[PDB]
Every structure is written in structure tokens, then in C-alpha cells.
Design a protein around this nucleic acid. Structure first.
Ligand SMILES: [K+]
Ligand SMILES: [K+]
Ligand SMILES: [K+]
Ligand SMILES: [K+]
Ligand SMILES: [K+]
Ligand SMILES: [K+]
Ligand SMILES: [Mg+2]
Ligand SMILES: [Mg+2]
Ligand SMILES: [Mg+2]
Ligand SMILES: [Mg+2]
Ligand SMILES: [Mg+2]
Ligand SMILES: [Mg+2]
Ligand SMILES: [Mg+2]
Ligand SMILES: [Mg+2]
Ligand SMILES: [Mg+2]
Ligand SMILES: [Mg+2]
Ligand SMILES: [Mg+2]
Ligand SMILES: [Mg+2]
Ligand SMILES: [Mg+2]
Ligand SMILES: [Mg+2]
Ligand SMILES: [Mg+2]
Ligand SMILES: [Mg+2]
Ligand SMILES: [Mg+2]
Ligand SMILES: [Mg+2]
Ligand SMILES: [Mg+2]
Ligand SMILES: [Mg+2]
Ligand SMILES: [Mg+2]
Ligand SMILES: [Mg+2]
Ligand SMILES: [Mg+2]
Ligand SMILES: [Mg+2]
Ligand SMILES: [Mg+2]
Ligand SMILES: [Mg+2]
Ligand SMILES: [Zn+2]
Lengths: 122, 43, 18, 162, 38, 101, 60, 222, 38, 51
RNA sequence: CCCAUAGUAGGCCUAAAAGCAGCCACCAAUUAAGAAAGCGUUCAAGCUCAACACCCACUACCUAAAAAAUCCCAAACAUAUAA
RNA sequence: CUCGAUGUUGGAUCAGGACAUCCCGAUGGUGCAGCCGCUAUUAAAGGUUCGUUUGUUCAACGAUUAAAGUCCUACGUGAUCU
């Protein structure tokens, strides 16, 4: 019978080789996720369809930010085959009230607080 | 002269289906994406 | 067309007790 | 090399052998540590059936292949060169290594069919009357499988079956 | 000749030769040993 | 030896083997002598004389074969192998026998 | 195997129900067509053939 | 001067009083009256019993699942006994007598009407289980001649093995998994539910790891 | 349909079939063939 | 030299970037002088309007 | 590939069993050759293998096919930088 | 699939095709002397009888023939017939 899958915890234990490959820092884990759905929920069990709705991933290729906490990660582990998970990067820190309207999320996962639409002078 | 008994893709006797070169690459490409998802759920 | 046999097992139709 | 000459003078047959000029390997191979002539010159996986300059160094004057022991080739490259020589003969790239013909024998005219990459002898291949379904198609082989490891400069690998 | 899927030499005089795209067994001493690959 | 025994030595009258054992180019001639001096080969024709001449003159080895028809076969083993000399020796036997009969 | 004989509607016209058994060493011929199924006929045709050849061996 | 080598000595090996294979009956002494389900899982997956040598040094290794009926046992018993040397060789059974009941309905019956009567008995055999084990004052080459003949007559793929060949076969497989340059393996993908692959896989694939498919065993899978 | 265990090799699902092809054993390939070195 | 000893495509040698930078300036100045003197006729443009 | 003498037809059994129907032993001559591994003979002969010598045969020791009934069935291609 | 119908045996008529070849052709093996056979490879261009009984397909039997082949074709073909 096809039932829900229990993923062993050994799968989610990063080796030192993995850290070098992906550049993550285990001592400074990223605060937020960037979850994007890249696979259809059709031809998948209903519990995967429901979790996608809970995460706000109804529309594919639409980035969504979620907190890097065990409860949120538990939902991600169920539909990890339908999504792309990337860490959110803040080169200039969190957006402030002054630059709320000048933010953009680049394809590299970086949220830039200034977006001038001009070439760099350097 | 070569016909599949019954329907092609169902039944005891089926029309064989073969994995092309790009079919493997597409699966490997999605496998790499999910492998990186395992890393970001570990921290 | 041949006349077949019959099952000799009877009963066993009880529902679950919940 | 060595030659055998048979002369009959005064109803007496005399058989003699003499040593002719023997070619020598070109000095200073790029890979002296190589164990066989192919890899000593970095020619492994880098020659085809039409490279008759390389193939003519390992064949007899009548087109026959030379022994592996005499040439010193490895077993893998000996079979590669042997098949390349066969394809060269069928492609007509070796007109000066024709089989020996006994005196008084003149071959009859035969149809001229240009061919290349001929894996199998033309006189021993049956026609494909029934191609078969797309999932069981009977293919026409092209080239030799022993040349699958040749350096391919194209993204598409060699198609050995057409 | 007798068509065979596995060719075996039945005596010392039999020899395997590949002719017309298939393997054969020939024996001058015992002609009954001749076999053809099927 | 076995191949030469099948053909036999009927049309051969005398076989003379000349070689210098102290030279470095008489191995092929000595191998030819061993094949001919075999009991099986000699048993085919007891009227055929096999003579081995050993000399220290430094001359190149030579094999002289005399047939019943009077023709002579001379094979010089200085630059010939034992197998080649045997094949030439066998070919002449197959031809001199046909001419006589 | 051959088609039976009798007033039996369409089944005989297409179905080879009758079975004929011939014992080559003895030449005895046994035919049975009572049952609609050939296998049922074949078994009884064997049984009659066994019984008839049982007498033959006794005669033998 | 030809170089000779020492030969092994079998003077320390004892031969039982009954070297030949014992007779195996079609059915047990007491016939079974409770009909059993099909239970196809008895020939599915690796064998967890009779996978190691006990007394002998040579045996027939089962490379797939299948059922052995009385016809196969007679083929094994007659061929091995005829082709063996009782004074220096002995053979034993590594499989039990046929015990699993097999039911066959009457010929020509339509579907329904209960379950058919018991017809014969079979012995379920999984992959990797020894069937017949031999040993004694002999080499592997002496017994490999007819053991391979018997092996190819079994309903499942089989091959004659020895204590050395079987150990080499297992160690070669372990080496293949160790030096496998493929970054993706069946075990890793299936256990982690990558791509949601378990929707098309079986729960048994978590332990079979792609090496088994139905009753078939694939030694080339790592 | 067919059961889990069949006498014939049951046709695999295409998703499973692609998984088998991807996860094939790849033997290590040395940079230089051993026969080409002393 | 064999058939597979060298790639089928001919070798391509790109110009020296130090020299080519001077060459680019000459070309840009040449085209710029055309605009100053008006050495052009009808002009066509490709514009991105309404997606 | 090349080559093969001998105690001795070992004893026993057997009409006969001589390496090769069974049983026991399986020692020894010659630099080298099993009281015989495979054929053969009514029994013997006879032909090979394991020996010596010669000599770098300097071997792979992983495997196997096909047949249906209107008419084969896209055409083709092994070579120009993985997109 | 078809019951707001897809008409059943066998025969007549016309036959289309497969080859797993009955005959004729070409070959290998034989416990192939020859004459007749057995077995296998290859070959589908051509041919493959007339009658008594039985509704018959068959089968039995008579007389022949180089041979009286095995099957498919909605158990070929009833808007052609019986
Ligand atoms: K089907
Ligand atoms: K089998
Ligand atoms: K005896
Ligand atoms: K109807
Ligand atoms: K015809
Ligand atoms: K009538
Ligand atoms: Mg269909
Ligand atoms: Mg109950
Ligand atoms: Mg109930
Ligand atoms: Mg209750
Ligand atoms: Mg080939
Ligand atoms: Mg009636
Ligand atoms: Mg009625
Ligand atoms: Mg099921
Ligand atoms: Mg003796
Ligand atoms: Mg004796
Ligand atoms: Mg005897
Ligand atoms: Mg003995
Ligand atoms: Mg003797
Ligand atoms: Mg020997
Ligand atoms: Mg077409
Ligand atoms: Mg198209
Ligand atoms: Mg209508
Ligand atoms: Mg008709
Ligand atoms: Mg017709
Ligand atoms: Mg035919
Ligand atoms: Mg045909
Ligand atoms: Mg004709
Ligand atoms: Mg003849
Ligand atoms: Mg009809
Ligand atoms: Mg009509
Ligand atoms: Mg009608
Ligand atoms: Zn033979």
C-alpha cells in the first residue's frame, strides 16, 4: 500500500563535505527560507496537495519566504520533492521603513534594499 | 506485422518503453535540486 | 460448460466489533 | 626484412634467404614509457579506418595482418587496427595491398559499389526484409564497436547502428 | 549438418570456422560431427 | 615430423645435412635434421640415406637432397627457418613423386 | 478431434467436441461425443480405450 | 625444467556412511487438509536461511526465486548420485522436502465455486540459498562438471559455487558498491523518498534496494 | 493485473524504469590505462 | 597527424586585447564622426513597447 | 606443439580380465613415463592424455537462435566544440 | 465491441496469403554399396485425383497419382448459390 513516507533523520545530517559544496555555515544557520514550487501537485497524494496550500505555494515559480524552524521544516520535508529551498541572503540587512518600496529579490537569493535600475559606475 | 496484443501501455504484454539520454538528464537534474533541499533542511 | 463444486465454508460474515 | 628466392639451374633447385633493408622506428618517441607502439606516440583513441598511413605499417605486402608478437602491439590495439584494416580494404583505400593471384588467373568484372565503414564482409550479410517495429527495429551496423572509445570532438557520440 | 545453438567439437579432428556470418563445425574424419549455428 | 611422415620419403634417394655446430646460424638446419632423423620419417623409406656432415670450416649450413629422378634440392639455412625448409622439402617430394609415376 | 453428430444447435457446427483415439500398435479406434467438452470426451474416450486395450493385453 | 607445486591432502576428511542423496517424497508422511493461500512472498527477496556452507565445500547457489516440485528433486538426486564418486564424495540436501500445498481446479471449470483441491507440493526457494551441498576428497573442478548441469535444469537461475568462489562473489559485490562512481544509488533515493519515487516503488524496495524484482535477482545492481 | 511475483519479468513503471537507468553501476576509470604503464 | 589527432574545426586566434582596444576606439570614432557630419539616411530602430 | 621403453599380462576373481568388467594394493627401472585419465580389443593388439627433452603455444577461462498467414515500413545519418 | 440483428454446419463457385514443404528443384549427415528410405538446411514460381457409404468436417474402403501437404482468411466467401 502507498502511505506517507518516514524520512530517516540521517538524511538531514549535513556532512562537512556538503558544507563546502553548498557554502552553508552550520554554526550560523540561515534565518529564513526561500521556497519555490517547481513541480505540480497533480498525480501526488492529497496530503501533499494540502501542505502546498498551507505553505502558500499554489502558483509555481513564485518565491515564498518561510522561517527556518523545525515545525516549518517538517512540512517542507513532506513536499521537498516539489519545491526548491534556498536560504534568504541580506547583503544590506533587513529592509527599513525608508527603503521598503525599493526592495527586490534577485535570482541568487539576495534581497537588495536598493534597486535603481541603473548600470554600476565601477 | 508487429502489433502489441490488447492496449499498448497496459496489460501483461506491453509495448516496451526505453529511457532516452535526455530522460536520464532530466531526472538527474531534479535529483540534484532535491539533494540541495536536504542540505538546507539540516540547519 | 462444466458444473463446478461448492464452497464448504459457511459463516464468518461477522462485522467488526469497533 | 628477409626474402626467399628459389632458382633452378641445371635441373637443380636452390633455396636461399637474404636480408634486405629493415626500417627503424623514428627516434625520440613522445611517450617512451609506453608499452606498445600505439601509446608510445599518443595515438590511442586517435585514429580511424581511413588513417592508412598508420594502418599500412602493420600489414603484409598482400594486405594480410602482421602477428601481434612481431609488431609488439597490445591486444586491445591489435584488434582495433585489424578491424580498421578490414574496413580500409573494403573501402578501397589500399589498392597496392591486393591479394596474391596465381599465374593465368584474371578476375572477372564485378559491379563497383562504393562503401566505407563496412563492418561485415559484403558477401555474408543477408538483406533486412522485415525491419520490425520501432521498439524492435533491426538496425544496420556502421563502423566497428571497437572504435567506440575514439576521441569524439562532437557532443553526439558515434552512432554504430543505422 | 545439424542446426545447433551451442557448438561443441565431438572429437580432436573437429575445427571451428566462421563462414557466411555464422560459426560451423567441420570434421573430415567423422562427417556426422558437422554442425551449423542456428 | 608427423606431417613429413604422412608424405613419406619414397622419391628421395639421399639427404645430406651440412652445418657447423660452433656457428650461430645453424639452429634452423639442426632442427631440420631432428625432424628428418625421426624414426617415423625414416621408416617410410629404408632406401633413403640420411647423412649428417659436421664441419668446422666456418661455412654456412647447407642441405642437399637427391631424388630418384636425379634432380637435386639445395636449401641454405643461413637465413631460412626450419618450417620453411620443411615446406619446401615437402613440396618437392609431392612433385618429384608425380613426375616419376 | 472432429465435430460431433446430433441435434445440438450451433455448438457442434463450430466446436470440435468429439475425440477419436487410435492406438497405432493395435489399430483400435475409440470415439466419444457424449459430452459437450472435448476434455470430458477425451477422458472418457481414454477410459474406453484403456478398458478395450485392457482386454487386448489379457488377450495378448 | 617444469616447475611442480604441492598438492592438497584430503586424508583428514571423513566420508559419511551414506554419501548419496536420500530419497525425497512427493508429499509429507501426513497429508495436509488445511489449504493454504498462494503466499508469493516466500520466493521474493533474499534468502535468510541456508545461505552458508555447513559440512561440504561445494554447493549449488540459487540466483533467483522459484518452487521445486518432486520432478526437480528426482532430476537433482539421479544426476548427482550417478555423476559422483561415493568413495571420495558425499552430498546432502540443503532444502526441505515439498511441503507447501498447491491447489488445482478441475480442467474446464469456470471461475468460482470455492478453492480447488490440493494437487501437489512444492518447496519455496529464495535467491542466495544453497540447494545441494557436496564435499569430500575432491576438488571443485571435479564436481563443477555436473553441478552446473543440474543448476541449469532448475526453474530458477543457479550456479555451482565453492567456499572460495562464493566468498569471492560476495567480496566482489562489496567492492563494486565501494568504488561505485555513480553519485545516485537506488538505496539513497528510495529511502529518502527523493522525487516521490516511493509512489511507484514497493515497501520491500527499502530493503531490496533495487537488487530484486519479483522473483528475479540482479547481481549487477549496486 | 499481474501480481507482485510473476513467472515473466513484469514490465516496470516508467518512473521506476528511469530510476534504474540513472542508478546503474559506473566502474572507476583510470586516467591512464594500466597496460600502457610499465 | 591522423584524422582524429586534431579537432576538425580550424584553430582560431583572437586579437590581442591591448591592440584590439585601440582598434575599437578607432571604429567608434569613425562611426561617431559620421553622426556629426550626418552621413546617414533613413534610420530604423527596434523599440520595446507594450511587452 | 613434441614424445612414449620397462619389472609386469601386479595380485585376486574370472572360460578369458593383459593400464582401461569387478576387488586389493598403487610400490618401482630408466634423466624422464599413473600398476593408468579418455577411446578401443571376445580377451590381447591399436590410438591418445598425464612424463622427459625441445621451447618463451609468453590463450579467453565472463555469454549465444529462430516461424504466420493483404504489403517492409517515416526518409536518413557513425566527425565542426551542450546548446 | 455488436441483441432499434455482426445470419450458423457442410457443399458449390472463386480463391488471397503463411511455410512449420506432400510432390517437383538444390544441398549436409547416415547404421547412405546400388535400388528404395531416414534426418537436417534451402526453396512458396508450379502442382496437389476420381469414386462407394455418411448432412457431414473427419474416418473407413475401392482405383490411381511425381504428390493426393499443414494452416489462416468474420470456423475466407449465403445483398453469388445450395
Ligand atoms: K496489452
Ligand atoms: K533455468
Ligand atoms: K582388465
Ligand atoms: K446480438
Ligand atoms: K502453392
Ligand atoms: K449420402
Ligand atoms: Mg490494440
Ligand atoms: Mg471475520
Ligand atoms: Mg462484513
Ligand atoms: Mg462482539
Ligand atoms: Mg562487429
Ligand atoms: Mg434432439
Ligand atoms: Mg433440444
Ligand atoms: Mg496488483
Ligand atoms: Mg605395467
Ligand atoms: Mg588389472
Ligand atoms: Mg577391457
Ligand atoms: Mg584404480
Ligand atoms: Mg597397450
Ligand atoms: Mg603428453
Ligand atoms: Mg515507409
Ligand atoms: Mg515524421
Ligand atoms: Mg442499425
Ligand atoms: Mg467452400
Ligand atoms: Mg490460392
Ligand atoms: Mg523452409
Ligand atoms: Mg522462410
Ligand atoms: Mg517446379
Ligand atoms: Mg551422400
Ligand atoms: Mg464461415
Ligand atoms: Mg456476404
Ligand atoms: Mg454457408
Ligand atoms: Zn569430429
Amino acid at each position: 500500500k502507498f502511505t506517507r513516507s518516514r524520512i530517516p533523520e540521517k538524511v538531514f545530517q549535513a556532512s562537512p563535505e556538503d558544507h563546502e559544496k553548498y557554502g552553508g555555515d552550520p554554526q550560523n544557520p540561515h534565518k529564513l527560507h526561500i521556497v519555490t514550487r517547481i513541480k505540480s501537485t497533480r498525480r501526488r497524494p492529497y496530503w501533499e496537495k494540502d501542505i502546498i496550500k498551507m505553505l502558500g505555494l499554489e502558483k509555481a515559480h513564485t518565491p515564498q519566504v518561510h522561517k527556518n524552524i523545525p515545525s516549518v521544516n517538517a512540512k517542507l520535508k513532506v513536499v521537498k520533492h516539489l519545491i526548491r529551498i534556498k536560504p534568504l541572503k541580506l547583503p544590506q540587512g533587513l529592509p527599513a521603513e525608508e527603503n521598503m518600496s525599493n526592495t527586490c529579490l534577485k535570482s541568487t537569493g539576495e534581497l537588495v534594499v536598493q534597486w535603481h535600475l541603473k548600470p554600476v559606475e565601477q | 506485422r508487429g502489433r502489441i496484443p490488447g492496449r499498448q501501455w497496459i496489460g501483461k504484454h506491453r509495448r516496451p518503453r526505453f529511457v532516452s539520454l535526455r530522460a536520464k538528464q532530466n531526472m538527474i537534474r531534479r535529483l540534484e535540486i532535491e539533494a540541495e533541499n536536504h542540505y538546507w533542511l539540516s540547519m | 460448460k462444466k458444473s463446478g463444486g461448492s464452497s464448504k465454508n459457511l459463516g464468518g460474515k461477522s462485522s467488526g466489533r469497533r | 626484412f628477409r626474402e626467399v628466392v628459389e632458382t633452378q639451374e641445371g635441373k637443380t633447385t636452390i633455396i636461399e634467404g637474404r636480408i634486405t633493408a629493415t626500417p627503424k622506428e623514428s627516434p625520440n618517441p613522445p611517450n617512451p614509457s609506453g608499452q606498445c607502439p600505439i601509446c608510445r606516440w599518443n595515438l590511442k583513441h586517435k585514429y580511424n579506418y581511413d588513417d592508412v598511413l598508420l594502418l599500412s605499417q602493420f600489414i603484409r605486402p598482400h594486405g594480410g595482418m602482421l602477428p601481434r608478437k612481431i609488431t609488439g602491439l597490445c591486444q586491445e590495439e591489435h584488434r582495433k587496427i585489424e578491424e580498421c584494416v578490414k574496413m580500409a580494404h573494403r573501402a578501397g583505400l589500399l589498392p597496392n595491398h591486393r591479394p596474391r593471384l596465381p599465374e593465368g588467373v584474371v578476375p572477372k568484372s564485378k559491379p563497383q559499389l562504393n562503401r566505407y565503414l563496412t563492418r561485415w564482409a559484403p558477401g555474408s550479410v543477408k538483406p533486412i526484409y522485415k525491419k520490425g517495429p520501432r521498439w524492435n527495429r533491426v538496425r544496420m551496423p556502421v563502423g566497428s564497436p571497437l572504435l567506440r572509445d575514439n576521441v569524439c570532438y562532437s557532443r553526439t557520440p558515434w552512432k554504430l547502428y543505422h | 549438418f545439424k542446426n545447433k545453438t551451442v557448438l561443441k567439437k565431438r572429437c580432436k579432428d573437429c575445427y571451428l570456422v566462421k563462414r557466411r556470418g555464422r560459426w560451423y563445425v567441420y570434421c573430415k574424419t567423422h562427417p556426422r560431427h558437422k554442425q551449423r549455428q542456428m | 615430423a608427423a606431417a613429413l611422415a604422412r608424405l613419406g620419403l619414397r622419391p628421395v634417394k639421399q639427404v645430406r645435412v651440412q652445418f657447423c655446430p660452433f656457428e650461430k646460424n645453424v639452429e634452423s638446419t639442426r632442427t631440420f635434421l631432428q625432424t628428418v632423423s625421426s624414426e617415423k620419417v625414416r621408416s617410410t623409406n629404408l632406401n633413403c640415406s640420411v647423412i649428417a656432415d659436421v664441419r668446422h670450416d666456418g661455412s654456412e649450413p647447407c642441405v642437399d637432397v637427391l631424388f630418384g629422378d636425379g634432380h637435386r634440392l639445395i636449401m641454405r639455412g643461413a637465413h631460412l627457418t626450419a618450417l620453411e625448409m620443411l615446406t619446401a622439402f615437402a613440396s618437392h617430394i609431392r612433385a618429384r613423386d608425380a613426375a616419376g609415376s | 478431434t472432429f465435430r460431433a453428430k446430433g441435434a445440438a444447435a450451433q455448438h457442434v457446427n463450430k466446436t470440435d467436441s468429439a475425440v477419436r483415439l487410435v492406438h497405432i500398435p493395435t489399430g483400435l479406434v475409440v470415439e466419444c461425443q457424449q459430452e459437450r467438452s472435448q476434455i470430458k470426451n477425451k477422458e472418457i474416450a481414454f477410459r474406453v480405450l484403456r478398458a478395450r486395450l485392457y482386454q487386448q493385453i489379457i488377450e495378448k | 625444467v617444469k616447475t611442480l607445486l604441492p598438492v592438497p591432502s584430503f586424508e583428514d576428511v571423513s566420508i559419511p556412511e551414506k554419501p548419496k542423496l536420500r530419497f525425497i517424497e512427493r508429499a509429507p508422511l501426513v497429508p495436509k487438509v488445511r489449504r493454504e493461500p498462494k503466499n508469493l512472498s516466500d520466493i521474493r527477496g533474499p534468502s535468510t536461511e541456508a545461505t552458508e556452507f555447513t559440512e561440504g565445500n561445494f554447493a549449488i547457489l540459487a540466483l533467483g526465486g522459484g518452487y521445486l516440485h518432486w520432478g526437480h528433486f528426482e532430476m537433482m538426486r539421479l544426476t548427482i548420485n550417478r555423476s559422483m564418486d561415493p568413495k571420495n564424495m558425499f552430498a546432502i540436501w540443503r532444502v526441505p522436502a515439498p511441503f507447501k500445498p498447491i491447489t488445482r481446479k478441475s480442467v474446464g471449470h469456470r471461475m468460482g465455486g470455492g478453492k480447488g483441491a490440493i494437487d501437489h507440493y512444492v518447496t519455496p526457494v529464495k535467491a542466495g540459498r544453497l540447494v545441494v551441498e557436496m564435499g569430500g576428497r575432491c576438488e571443485f573442478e571435479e564436481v563443477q562438471g555436473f553441478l552446473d548441469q543440474v543448476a541449469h535444469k532448475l526453474p530458477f537461475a543457479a550456479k555451482a559455487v565453492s567456499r572460495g568462489t562464493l566468498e569471492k562473489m560476495r567480496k566482489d559485490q562489496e567492492e563494486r558498491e565501494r568504488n561505485n562512481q555513480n553519485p545516485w544509488t537506488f538505496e539513497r533515493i528510495a529511502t529518502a523518498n527523493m522525487l516521490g519515487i516511493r509512489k511507484v516503488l514497493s515497501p520491500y524496495d527499502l530493503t531490496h534496494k533495487g537488487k530484486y524484482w519479483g522473483k528475479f535477482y540482479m547481481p549487477k545492481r549496486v | 493485473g499481474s501480481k507482485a511475483v510473476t513467472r515473466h519479468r513484469r514490465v516496470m513503471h516508467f518512473q521506476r524504469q528511469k530510476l534504474m537507468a540513472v542508478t546503474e553501476y559506473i566502474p572507476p576509470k583510470p586516467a591512464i590505462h594500466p597496460s600502457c604503464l610499465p | 597527424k591522423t584524422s582524429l589527432s586534431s579537432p576538425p574545426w580550424p584553430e582560431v586566434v583572437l586579437p590581442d586585447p591591448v591592440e584590439e582596444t585601440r582598434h575599437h576606439a578607432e571604429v567608434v570614432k569613425k562611426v561617431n564622426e559620421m553622426i556629426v557630419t550626418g552621413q546617414y539616411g533613413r534610420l530604423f530602430a527596434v523599440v520595446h513597447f507594450a511587452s
